[PDB]
Design a protein around this ligand. Structure first.
Ligand SMILES: *C(=O)/C=C/c1ccc(O)cc1
Length: 122
């Protein structure tokens, strides 16, 4: 499955951990409050985070403070509220990692109270 696919949430809904770890792009699942439900191997290759240990943490408060901004967290909460989350933009990640330019795609999941954040290098 390709980053930015129109029905990416359908494909990923069918995947287990190993399959999510096989994706070409970083994939995080958050609940509506921003707590991390899932975090794949490709994401940890970009950020230096251990996917096994960031589970349960809050993405915006603790893990990724640079994303606590109208440009990222603001768009997340707008989409959670509207129920339409599906948005793409560029960003730079730089907390406890080398500053890294990325493309981000956020999209609501099919499962309850879950939201995908997809990331690739640019
Ligand atoms: C800015 O501080 C971003 C940090 C970051 C983004 C994404 C991650 O999965 C981990 C840290």
């Amino acid at each position: 499955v390709a980053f930015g696919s129109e029905d990416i949430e359908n494909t990923l809904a069918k995947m287990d951990d190993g399959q999510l770890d096989g994706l070409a792009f970083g994939a995080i699942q958050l609940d509506g409050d921003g707590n991390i439900l899932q975090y794949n191997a490709a994401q940890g290759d970009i950020t230096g985070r251990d996917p096994k240990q960031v589970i349960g943490k809050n993405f915006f408060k603790d893990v990724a403070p640079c994303t606590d901004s109208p440009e990222f967290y603001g768009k997340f909460k707008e989409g959670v509220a509207s129920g339409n989350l599906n948005t793409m933009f560029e960003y730079t990640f730089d907390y406890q990692m080398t500053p890294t330019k990325v493309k981000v795609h956020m999209k609501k999941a099919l499962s309850g109270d879950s939201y995908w954040v997809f990331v690739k290098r640019v």
